[PDB]
């Protein structure tokens, strides 16, 4: 991913975009009952905390495009992966504007809370002003489509979330590249059925975990994995992606019956962006707020891992590559051990910064004891070991609970944390409930007891 140019939006007929300069995050009722070292990410260039140019820091994620074409390995990876997906019978039909808007089996309705992007975010129009769950009115959308078309600029927003102290001082705030509602609707129409197929088939055949339910899914994973596990995390995956990777992606779409709309993928690749008063163009890089981002990111990852394997271990049997990805996050396995550090090396030649899974200092052996996927661990239940607990560290949970965006969602927010936490064991969960109930707000919430959660879990399978 690399920025080709950037200049004043007025210089090209575009309005300056307004983005709140104030975080919605504020200390919560539990701010002092729990330990935490994260603060609301920098949202503006002014933020007193800064220690380097904001503007520069945020965009540095666009490290450049390391590769130019789709080499032999990438092509073989394309063939093999496209091969597996072929065994899914993925319906190649377009998705009717209705289902694409209010959802259907295997796909949720568009999210009404998130932006609507240009031009609507500059005309003042909002999402609830275009559709409604009970009506399922295509007409209003339809008109806007005919009126403004597709391929509309991406409105870039700085993401309002918690970040480490360093990532604050280095203005390393993450960006949300929101795509116009039109575009999103189009893409959901073109790739609607693909999305469903994936959401409904998390596993090693899609090599995707998107739309999965950790409480149930963690138990199917080990069965799917091969003997030896390997993993690593990417540094700025999305932005590092070169145009070649998008092509490989189209080659895959093409082979599975979507050669039809591979055009849409071009839009994610060669991007048109609006950030404040400035406008820029990006060659490569996956936009963060786009319909399919998650899935396409995962499909590309299936291609990447296959590529570095064919390139490094000639003769390797991909049919025994068992991997599951979720965007940049991946968990893989092979009958034989492989050198992650070595694969990481080939990664650079392909423009990817891969590192020891979980900020390790070095690439060590990956085991069921130390492997994590989605920040979660795998831990067999003491009473019925054949059931696996997805275990999120408490530190993460402690961090999230010390803050709040909307006081009216404290019930839902804490409840959620509880659904993650209890897997850390009953003793641990109770200490958590205890502290929560050590202040008025907590004591007022409706939280599930350990035994309630654990039983409900046992029956869920």
Ligand X SMILES: O=c1ccn([C@@H]2O[C@H](COP(=O)(O)OP(=O)(O)OP(=O)(O)O)[C@@H](O)[C@H]2O)c(=O)[nH]1
Residues that bind ligand X (CB under 6 A): 159, 172, 174-176, 233-238, 288, 327-328
Shortest separation between residue 330's beta carbon and Mn ion, angstroms: 9
233 is in an annotated binding site: yes
Helix (H) or strand (E) holding 75: helix 72-86
Residue 329 touches which of ligand X, Na ion, Mn ion, none (Cβ within 5-8 Å per kind): Mn ion
**If binding is defined by CB under 5 A, does position 238 make contact with Mn ion?**
no
CA dist 241 and 131 (Å) reads 34
**If binding is defined by CB under 5 A, does position 329 make contact with Mn ion?**
yes
CB distance 371 to 331 below 8 Å: yes
**If binding is defined by CB under 5 A, does position 233 make contact with Mn ion?**
yes
Shortest separation between residue 158's beta carbon and ligand X, angstroms: 10
CA dist 68 and 271 (Å) reads 17
Residues found near Na ion in the complex (CB under 5 A): 271, 282, 285
326 versus 454: smaller Cβ distance to ligand X: 326
Residue 38 touches which of Na ion, Mn ion, ligand X, none (Cβ within 5-8 Å per kind): none
CA dist 177 and 268 (Å) reads 10
CA dist 329 and 238 (Å) reads 11
Give the CB-nearest residue to ligand X. 235
- Residue from the set 158, 208, 328, 432 that interacts with Mn ion by CB under 5 A: 328
**If binding is defined by CB under 5 A, does position 99 make contact with Mn ion?**
no
99 versus 329: smaller Cβ distance to Mn ion: 329
Shortest separation between residue 58's beta carbon and Na ion, angstroms: 15
Shortest separation between residue 177's beta carbon and ligand X, angstroms: 8
238 is in an annotated binding site: no
CB distance 348 to 322 below 8 Å: no
Query: Furthest-apart CA pair in the chain: how many Å?
Result: 67
Could you write out the three-class secondary structure of 104-163? ECCECCCCCCCCCCCCHHHHCCCHHHCCCCCCCCHHHHHHHHHHHCCCCCEEEEECCCEE
70 versus 352: smaller Cβ distance to Mn ion: 352
CB distance 384 to 368 below 8 Å: no
Residue 247 touches which of Mn ion, Na ion, ligand X, none (Cβ within 5-8 Å per kind): none
């Amino acid at each position: 991913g690399e920025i080709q140019w950037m200049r004043p939006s007025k210089e090209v007929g575009y309005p300056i975009i307004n983005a709140p300069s104030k975080t919605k995050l504020e200390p919560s009722a539990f701010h002092y009952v729990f330990e935490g070292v994260k603060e609301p990410a920098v949202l503006t260039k002014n933020d007193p905390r800064l220690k380097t140019d904001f503007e520069e820091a945020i965009f540095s994620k666009y490290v450049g495009n390391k590769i130019t074409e789709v080499d032999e390995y990438m092509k073989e990876a394309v063939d093999h992966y496209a091969g597996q997906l072929m065994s899914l019978d993925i319906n190649t039909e377009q998705m009717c504007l209705e289902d694409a808007m209010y959802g259907t089996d295997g796909l949720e309705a568009l999210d009404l809370s998130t932006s609507a992007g240009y031009p609507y975010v500059a005309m003042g129009k909002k999402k609830r002003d275009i559709l409604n769950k009970q009506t399922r009115d295509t007409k209003e959308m339809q008109k806007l489509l005919d009126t403004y078309g597709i391929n509309l600029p991406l409105v870039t927003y700085v993401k309002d979330e918690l970040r480490s102290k360093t990532k604050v001082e280095q203005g390393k705030s993450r960006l949300i590249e929101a795509s116009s509602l039109n575009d999103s609707v189009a893409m959901r129409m073109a790739f609607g059925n693909l999305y469903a197929a994936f959401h409904k088939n998390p596993g090693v055949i899609t090599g995707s975990a998107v739309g999965c339910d950790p409480d149930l899914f963690w138990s199917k994973i080990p069965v799917l994995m091969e003997e030896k596990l390997f993993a690593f995390d990417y540094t700025g995956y999305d932005a590092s992606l070169s145009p070649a990777w998008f092509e490989a992606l189209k080659m895959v779409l093409e082979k599975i019956g979507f050669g039809d709309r591979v055009d849409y993928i071009d839009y994610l690749n060669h991007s048109h962006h609006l950030y404040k008063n400035k406008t820029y163009c990006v060659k490569g890089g996956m936009p963060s707020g786009c319909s399919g981002t998650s899935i396409f990111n995962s499909m590309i990852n299936n291609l990447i891992i296959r590529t570095l394997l064919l390139k490094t271990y000639k003769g390797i049997d991909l049919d025994h590559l068992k991997m599951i990805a979720y965007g940049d996050d991946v968990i893989a396995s092979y009958p034989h051990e492989v050198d992650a550090s070595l694969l990481a090396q080939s990664g650079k030649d392909y423009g990817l910064t891969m590192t020891p899974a979980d900020k390790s200092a070095t690439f060590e052996t990956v085991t069921w004891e130390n492997v994590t996927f989605l920040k979660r661990f795998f831990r067999a239940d003491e009473k019925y070991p054949f059931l696996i607990h997805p275990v999120m560290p408490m530190k993460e949970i402690h961090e999230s609970i010390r803050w709040t965006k909307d006081p009216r969602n404290t019930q839902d927010h804490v409840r959620s944390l509880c659904l993650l936490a209890w897997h850390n064991g009953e003793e641990e969960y109770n200490k958590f409930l205890a502290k929560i109930r050590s202040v008025p707000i907590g004591r007022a919430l409706d939280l599930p007891e350990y035994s309630t959660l654990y039983d409900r879990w046992l029956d869920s399978f």
